[PDB]
Design a protein around this ligand. Structure first.
Ligand SMILES: [Ca+2]
Ligand SMILES: [Ca+2]
Ligand SMILES: [Ca+2]
Ligand SMILES: [Ca+2]
Ligand SMILES: [Cl-]
Ligand SMILES: [Cl-]
Ligand SMILES: [Cl-]
Ligand SMILES: [Cl-]
Lengths: 252, 252, 252, 252
């Protein structure tokens, strides 16, 4: 129907890969070729591709890091994930008390962590990091029901990569009272963080060791606190993206 | 003879790779390009390609996992294997008595196993797993010629992958008598199994430790039974397939 | 000058890669595309490519095992090597006396070996294996100048691959006398060998331990003999080939 | 606008990759295809690509060693680096006294080194290697302010690769006096070096152990000298190149 023509122009750019079946390339009569690399496994297909319940039909996989080409001028669809936001961790275990003793010390004392891989596309770009946080003190470890516990949850994050030792403490709120830990009373820790490209390690911790906890139930650093990081997540569009596909496009 | 035209449409799908020289793509005037990846080494050629006695002539190899392209509109042939069905194992050694003690325990006690790699294309799809099973008790280990031995062969299969410990026992028949083990009297163990994508480990075992075997010849768990898995195989079309080739096709 | 046309036909074949700058593909108006894989590093260029003194000019390298494409219809040249024949080894050290004790024993006793990687293209195809062999006994280790030494050089070759133990002894001549070892008197060991595809390990050895050598100079198995494998080589066209390039060609 | 045509000619060559955003390929109506491999990560884009402060915009990355293709006839730009010259090392630590004891001995005694990877394109081609060198003796380790120290800085360079032991000593000047080490008085070590392709290891050293240094402050071999290699670099166009991109071009 349409004769092949030479491509004069190259255009290179990044596509944000998001959730569900979405268009990777639009119908574009000018386009002759696209060379594409996805940082995650990616399913590629035509208008028939669907992904009901995370099962792709009418697609085929290309691997993370695999360079491939599409030479059509028509619409092309992708699927990578059904995750609407980015959930880093969900914890049921109470978080530990921790002073800023550095990465090695926290790992040595079994403080759970997770890593954020900051893509070049997010290098030095501020983003929202949140947690759903549950404080419960009433009767916990036998603590009095009316004992006032001060809490201040934090993320301790490496300023360099996961091989460096120094941590930056990030906080957004403090709270004091007798915590009943009812699910509807959960707090939101919400900080902006700005990170260099690469992997950064994050330790969700309780920073406040309350005098009353020390006296009544012999709590000490690295012990389980009255604070639990129910969910650590981001709904920031910069983080909910599953990765950026690299595109070199050629057009007439 | 035919001018080159632009491709509007992409279509992504899987081809079941079967035995002998078969067509990979048909002659199709609309087709401009195919990007293909085979999970097994694959020999690709034109109408001249043959594979008499497993020696491919008029073909060339592409490696397992290698993405390659064909830009013709003509017929294209493949060869991967001359195996008509899938034979997992053939055993001459008597199978061991085993209780469901989990994967680690069976491996520790040298119960032979084999793995089934369930492709995404077979994720949660039921399939036939069979064995040709020979019971022979007459005079074996000095057992009486008229001693009645009860048998119940099984596959113990990991429900998770080969790194998980719990096993599911699959059976289809039990048999009792004095077994002469004549080749024409061999039984067929035939079960439907439904597995998640990934590797599952399978232990062919004898599940029944007959009282008479214990008393007469001091048989015990993990000892060699009167049961031999002559052949473990499947003639189910879902398993006889050597793999699924991934295809992205572009057409005018 | 010439409009692009669709390719109907695929043709897959192997090209023998030989020495110096040679044509990889001829000018062929029908050819639209070639997908090529070389088992050795290969330099590819146009009519200007030369390789005076093993330095390629007007070429660029593609790596061993790298699939690449050429989409021209013109002539294309390659270079891989300036070696006219295949030289496996040159030895200055006297070869050891060895009985056929198997691969492990010969390696344990420091009998030098070399490996032949038999390509699929040579699977079960007989080929010439030769050695330039020098026997020198006169005054060696203090042996009498007129002592008669019997010699019978051999290649001991694994019948399976380099991981298997059994060796096959190959011979073509025996010789007896007082050997002066003059370069112009060197012998040629020349055997036909037929090997399965894959790696085979070869031990050049002296098989004859002469009674007189035992008595006079206390020679024993695994000691240095009066035999030296000056050069082990093949000028058989099946072995002088540096490898076979895999070609899938598409034509109108 | 322009109908596709067949390519008759192949041309293979190397492009010197230099600093900032530069053209990789010019607009050339004859060009139909280029297959390219860069030995370093390379950012590729159209006329819009910029790299202000080392941040590429309007580009996408191709990895070191990754073969990729461009099928346009238009201009194509690259970026690899903002480094105008090649700086190998900058040292603040005083260099050690070293005799030519070979590679192993220098490494054993903690003499800092750096490696030069000589590309095939520079095999046996002479190039300038320089250092900004600071001698300071006045009061150093308590040395007299008018003690005359003789200096002769050198590069000791492996003649084979980094796995070989012998070193070649390269020098260009000697100097004698009482060194105040003022930044504006720094010397330039400037030698031509000719190296085979591959990695060569370089030890910047002080070769002269002055009698007065031995007597006054007990200096000995492998001790810190009065010489510091402030910067080791090359502004030779053969070395300032970040690498050579391999190009196979096809044209009508
Ligand atoms: Ca309190
Ligand atoms: Ca019984
Ligand atoms: Ca004799
Ligand atoms: Ca002096
Ligand atoms: Cl969208
Ligand atoms: Cl068929
Ligand atoms: Cl030729
Ligand atoms: Cl320039």
């Amino acid at each position: 129907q349409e004769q092949t023509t030479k491509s004069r122009d190259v255009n290179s750019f990044q596509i944000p890969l998001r959730d569900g079946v979405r268009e990777l390339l639009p119908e574009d009569a000018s386009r002759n070729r696209a060379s594409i690399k996805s940082p995650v496994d990616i399913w590629i297909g035509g208008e028939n591709m669907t992904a009901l319940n995370g099962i792709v039909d009418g697609g085929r996989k290309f691997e993370a890091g695999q360079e491939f080409q599409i030479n059509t001028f028509g619409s092309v669809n992708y699927w990578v994930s059904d995750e609407e936001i980015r959930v880093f961790k969900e914890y049921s275990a109470r978080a530990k008390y921790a002073q800023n003793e550095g990465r090695t010390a926290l790992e040595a004392n079994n403080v759970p962590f997770f890593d954020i891989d900051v893509p070049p596309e997010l290098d030095g770009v501020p983003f929202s990091l949140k947690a759903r946080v549950r404080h419960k003190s009433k009767g916990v470890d036998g603590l009095g029901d009316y004992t006032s516990i001060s809490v201040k949850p934090a993320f301790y994050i490496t300023e360099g990569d996961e091989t460096t030792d120094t941590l930056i403490k990030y906080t957004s709120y403090g709270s004091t009272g007798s915590h009943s830990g009812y699910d509807f009373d959960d707090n939101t820790l919400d900080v902006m963080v700005t990170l260099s490209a690469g992997v950064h390690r994050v330790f969700p911790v309780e920073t406040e060791l309350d005098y009353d906890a020390v006296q009544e139930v012999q709590h000490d650093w690295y012990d389980e606190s009255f604070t639990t990081f129910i969910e650590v997540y981001s709904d920031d569009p910069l983080l909910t993206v599953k990765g950026y596909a690299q595109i070199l496009m050629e057009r007439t």
